[PDB]
Ligand binder design. Structure first.
Ligand SMILES: Nc1nc2c(ncn2[C@@H]2O[C@H](COP(=O)(O)OP(=O)(O)OP(=O)(O)O)[C@@H](O)[C@H]2O)c(=O)[nH]1
Ligand SMILES: [Mg+2]
Ligand SMILES: [Mg+2]
Ligand SMILES: [Mg+2]
Ligand SMILES: [Mg+2]
Ligand SMILES: [Mg+2]
Ligand SMILES: [Mg+2]
Ligand SMILES: [Mg+2]
Ligand SMILES: [Mg+2]
Ligand SMILES: [Mg+2]
Ligand SMILES: [Mg+2]
Ligand SMILES: [Mg+2]
Ligand SMILES: [Mg+2]
Ligand SMILES: [Mg+2]
Ligand SMILES: [Mg+2]
Ligand SMILES: [Mg+2]
Ligand SMILES: [Mg+2]
Ligand SMILES: [Mg+2]
Ligand SMILES: [Mg+2]
Ligand SMILES: [Mg+2]
Ligand SMILES: [Mg+2]
Lengths: 511, 212
RNA sequence: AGAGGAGACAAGUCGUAACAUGGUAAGUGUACUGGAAAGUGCACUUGGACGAACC
RNA sequence: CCCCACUAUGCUUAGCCCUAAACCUCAACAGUUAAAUCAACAAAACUGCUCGCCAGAACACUACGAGCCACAGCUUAAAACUCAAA
RNA sequence: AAUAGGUUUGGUCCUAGCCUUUCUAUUAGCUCUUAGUAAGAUUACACAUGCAAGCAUCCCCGUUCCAGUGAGUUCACCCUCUAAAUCACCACGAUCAAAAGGGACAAGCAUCAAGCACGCAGCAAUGCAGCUCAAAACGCUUAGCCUAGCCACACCCCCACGGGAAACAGCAGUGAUUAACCUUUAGCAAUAAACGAAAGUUUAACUAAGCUAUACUAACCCCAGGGUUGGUCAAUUUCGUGCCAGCCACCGCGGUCACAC
């Protein structure tokens, strides 16, 4: 098939290059003050207005100090891809460390992968932090390293001015320039479905100027740009390089992090078609292999996922894929999607006896009533770790009960008798209780020099021609089993035990 | 085939009619005007631009009648627009006045008069329209004789007009076809077509009223 | 939802009820009976035959 | 199936039940044998008029509904799944 | 169903069903160069946003129209009577057309056969006991129709004082849903409507554009794909497969020499 793909333009000519604003991404560990620092820079407060005070989305804001594009990456271990995406699209990384953690190390690794300058922000103020970072290849100027370290206090707004000065100086040193003309090149930061504006994508422009009516393609998707808005929702008539923008008009929802390229006209579709064909071919090859492998031969939790944005859905799916307890319980992902819980999700859950998990999405009264009618369980969460805990609870519920065996008593056989009762010969074991006590209700097991011979309950417990339920220590008792095949010797042992069912918890750990 | 009765429709119609009749707005409420914004607060609708200056300068009919005995019965009232448009005496001779008692200044209501437009009086009195307009003036008692003084100019008006070309040709052809040989030009009688000027007062009785 | 029925799938099992006078002619109604096709009584039908001079 | 014995039953009276291969599987009435007689077999082919019925097989003299002195019943009587036949 | 054809069987004749051949529409697969024109959510489920009703010397008039949808459904047609409206004003009338009265008016089901007051007389009091129906009453289900267009609805409670609640079945657009998916264009220059005495103003009506092989028309120096090839039905060489993989609208093919994969 002819190659109709739309490819990225060659690197811009030096004459066409024009200076642009810098893209700075704030990365770090959970509760290291990234959101608070961004709030202080933005002159607005949004850390307080959050569900649990956790940043669960990657947002881009155009701050005017000069102008910078700040990207707030989540600090949680769940949204690793999100952080990576920021590293892929950023020009400068502000690594915020509270006065080094796992996610800080991961963000450092992402920045090294992206080959991007790093500015250290010692929040909550330091020398110990720099000395530790020496191990992680982050060397401060005090230690002869290029990385600039700035101690700051985001809560009190201390030393932030010098932090901004260092960011501006590093941006000037980088000399970030791009072509503000020609076909548009950009990257998707997020994609979601607004009930009023359709499929919307938060993107960052890397090259060219985006305008209303521009035809864009991203992955298997394409759009005719209908509305370009900012973080506040106001329409913007142009999108210069290094400018966040919410673009509406996508015929299909692009995956987060996919490149966006402008094309000449809608009959774009061909390009999309070609890409689809390519993907099909790849899948087809895999299919062929599997099919050939077949032809040469010749406790199930099903979960629906509905998230507000594709990035959160991807993070949840990555968490799900880290499931390793398939032996005890099998976790099947029936369907994942973006948007509020809908009729198709309810039907899918009902069909497979699954459970719907809704991350930052709603469910109307009609949907809830339908789910109640069909026996579907919708579980709406606003925090990712709450959803993880709920999924773990469901998995544990699917797990069978674990029987705990507690020893109750022990008796040693002394003699074997044959009693003729009801025309039947019953073998009776005369046993002396050594430690503990024996109870009729509690189960018993037979031990022969350490080997386990029988497991069950006595058919008749009798002492001194009288039936007694509990024999104390040192009491003789004749024991008769329900199994006639069991042979009683002179030196056999009997161990009594009580069995209690206990709740079993999933062995899978999200970390 | 028998339609099921719709009782609630008639009930709601009667309720609406009763509410409209009881809660009907008054003239002062309807025609109040905010001279700062030139809008009527009853409905919040701006008056047209060309009237603005008049609204800022002239006065309403009742605004003048309220300061006369028996609300000016028998007096003569004219309009500024008539004074600016026509030179002949145009005015109304009051015969009955119904002021709006709900107005604090009693500067609203209906009025009836005999119209004398361009020197021609009317055989009967009738309701005066455009009372609420900011266009009226009062003829002084000492100036009534001088102002009404008017000598009727002769009505030297045309009698007949030529037919339109195609119609004239068709009529002549019909004449010839029917056998008529008369050469008299067909003419159109315009004497019965009395061309009243566009500012001649209309029948206020048939005019509607704003809803509440 | 435990079950019943029909059809398909078509196995294996128990018989051989129908098609030849199918080895007790077949069938209808109805009643009783039976592991099962089915059997028998009563009346009816030929969608059976009686070999077509006498012998 | 063959033989023996006996009962319901076959009979009478008074009510029910209302079904048959209730078939001469050939509707009632009037008429024709003229022809273009006529798929086959059967008990020749038809015409006029009217009523009743029929519309692939099986599901199905079935289910449900309704009516009945009928209560394992009778009458009316479907549909879904299936087949390319019957 | 026709100029008919294949298919019951060891075979023939008859009856009969099913399918084929033809013409459209929608969707799907594969494919697709241009121009003109026509047509264009699956959904009476929910709607972000922007616009869609003004005019005008004030009163009035219009926003009851146009535009939309097909939920509901014998309010549509004919006759009689006569409202509102136009003919400036009466027209001592014409045109147009409500309400009211009479008649006509979709499909399936009779396993929907009885409805249960469905009639008449009298000025009234009141009296008679009738009225509809197997020539389909009553009832259930389905459906916009008889297309220069007409009927119905306008978020639901048939209505809409009121209540539920805060309404795109106006245009552009979106969520959900479906196999089904047009631009968040411009102008009032043409016509139509509203207003004005008028110059004129307004109009998502409309006009002129945008997207789409859904259709028709036309063309291209270069530019062609899709399906089919046992019979019906136009058209197969060689390999591999070996009743397996697979194909078929019907009859059917495939078990080592496959015109059927
Ligand atoms: N002592 C001190 N505390 C601070 C300072 N700045 C911020 N904090 C606190 O630290 C917390 C930081 O957590 P977040 O606001 O969620 O910011 P974050 O590091 O991006 O955390 P995530 O969004 O979950 O990744 C805030 O709740 C502040 O109360 C500071 O300068 N000094
Ligand atoms: Mg934070
Ligand atoms: Mg036999
Ligand atoms: Mg026999
Ligand atoms: Mg018999
Ligand atoms: Mg017997
Ligand atoms: Mg016997
Ligand atoms: Mg006898
Ligand atoms: Mg008989
Ligand atoms: Mg029977
Ligand atoms: Mg029966
Ligand atoms: Mg029954
Ligand atoms: Mg519909
Ligand atoms: Mg029934
Ligand atoms: Mg309908
Ligand atoms: Mg609606
Ligand atoms: Mg309504
Ligand atoms: Mg619309
Ligand atoms: Mg949509
Ligand atoms: Mg379509
Ligand atoms: Mg006019």
């Amino acid at each position: 098939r002819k190659n109709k793909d739309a490819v990225r333009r060659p690197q811009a000519d030096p004459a066409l290059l024009t200076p642009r604003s810098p893209v700075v991404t704030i990365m770090g560990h959970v509760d290291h003050g990234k959101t608070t620092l961004l709030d202080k820079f933005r002159k607005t407060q949004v850390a307080a207005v959050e569900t649990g005070g956790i940043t669960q989305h990657i947002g881009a804001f155009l701050v005017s100090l000069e102008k910078i594009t700040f990207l707030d990456t989540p600090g949680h271990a769940a949204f690793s891809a999100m952080r990576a995406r920021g590293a892929q699209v950023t020009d400068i990384v502000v690594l915020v460390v509270a006065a080094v953690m796992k996610q800080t190390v991961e963000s450092i690794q992402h920045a090294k992968d992206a080959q991007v300058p790093i500015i250290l922000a010692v929040n909550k103020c330091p020398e110990k932090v720099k000395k530790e970072l020496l191990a992680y290849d982050v060397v401060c100027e005090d230690y002869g390293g290029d990385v600039q370290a700035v101690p700051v206090s985001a809560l009190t707004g201390d030393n932030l001015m010098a932090l901004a000065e260092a960011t501006v100086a590093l941006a000037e040193m980088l000399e970030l320039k791009a072509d503000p003309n020609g076909p548009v090149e950009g990257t998707v930061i997020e994609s979601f479905t607004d009930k009023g504006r359709g499929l919307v994508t938060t993107a960052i422009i890397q090259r060219g100027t985006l305008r209303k009516g521009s035809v864009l393609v991203a992955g298997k998707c394409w759009a005719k740009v209908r509305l370009m808005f900012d973080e506040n929702g106001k329409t913007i008539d142009e999108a210069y390089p290094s400018m966040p923008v919410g673009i509406t008009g996508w015929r299909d929802l692009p995956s987060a992090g996919e490149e966006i390229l402008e094309v000449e006209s809608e009959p774009a579709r061909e390009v999309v078609d070609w890409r689809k064909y390519e993907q099909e071919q790849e899948k087809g090859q895999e299919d062929l292999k599997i099919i050939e492998e077949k032809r040469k031969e010749h406790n199930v939790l099903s979960v629906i996922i509905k998230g507000d944005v594709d990035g959160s859905v991807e993070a949840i799916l990555n968490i799900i894929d880290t499931y390793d307890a398939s032996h005890e319980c099998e976790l099947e992902l029936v369907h994942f999607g973006v948007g509020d819980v809908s009729a198709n999700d309810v039907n899918l859950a009902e069909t497979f006896d699954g459970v719907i998990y809704g991350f930052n999405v709603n469910a109307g009264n009609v949907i809830q009533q339908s789910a109640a009618k069909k026996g579907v369980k919708i579980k709406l969460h606003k925090i990712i770790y709450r959803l993880v805990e709920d999924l773990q609870e469901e998995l544990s519920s699917r797990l069978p009960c674990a029987v705990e065996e507690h020893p109750v008593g022990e008796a040693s056989i002394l003699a074997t008798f044959s009693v003729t009762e009801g025309k039947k010969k019953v073998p009776v074991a005369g046993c002396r209780v050594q430690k503990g006590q024996l109870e009729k209700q509690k189960k018993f097991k037979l031990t022969r020099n350490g080997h386990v011979i029988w497991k069950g309950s006595l058919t008749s417990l009798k002492h001194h021609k009288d039936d007694i339920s509990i024999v104390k220590t040192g009491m003789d008792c004749g024991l008769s089993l329900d199994e006639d095949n069991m042979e009683f010797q002179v030196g056999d042992r009997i161990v009594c035990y009580e069995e209690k069912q206990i709740q079993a918890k999933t062995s899978w750990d999200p970390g | 085939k028998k339609v099921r009765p719709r009782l609630i429709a008639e009930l709601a119609r009667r309720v609406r009619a009763l509410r409209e009749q009881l809660n009907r707005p008054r003239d002062s409420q309807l025609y109040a005007v905010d001279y700062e914004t030139l809008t009527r607060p009853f409905s919040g609708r701006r008056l047209p631009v060309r009237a603005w200056a008049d609204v800022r300068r002239e006065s309403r009919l009742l605004q003048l009648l309220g300061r006369l005995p028996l609300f000016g019965l028998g007096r003569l009232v004219t309009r500024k627009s008539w004074l600016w448009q026509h030179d002949e005496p145009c005015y109304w001779r009051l015969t009955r006045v119904r002021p709006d008692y709900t107005a604090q200044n009693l500067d609203h209501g209906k009025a009836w008069g005999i119209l004398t437009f361009k020197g021609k009086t009317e055989s009967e009195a009738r309701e005066i329209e455009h009372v609420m307009y900011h266009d009226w003036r009062l003829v002084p008692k000492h100036e009534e004789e001088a102002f009404t003084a008017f000598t009727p100019a002769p009505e030297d008006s045309l009698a007949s007009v030529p037919y339109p070309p195609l119609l004239r040709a068709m009529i002549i052809a019909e004449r010839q076809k029917n056998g008529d040989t008369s050469t008299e030009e067909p003419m159109l009688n315009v004497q019965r077509i009395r061309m009243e000027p566009w500012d001649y007062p209309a029948k206020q009785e048939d005019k509607g009223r704003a809803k509440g």
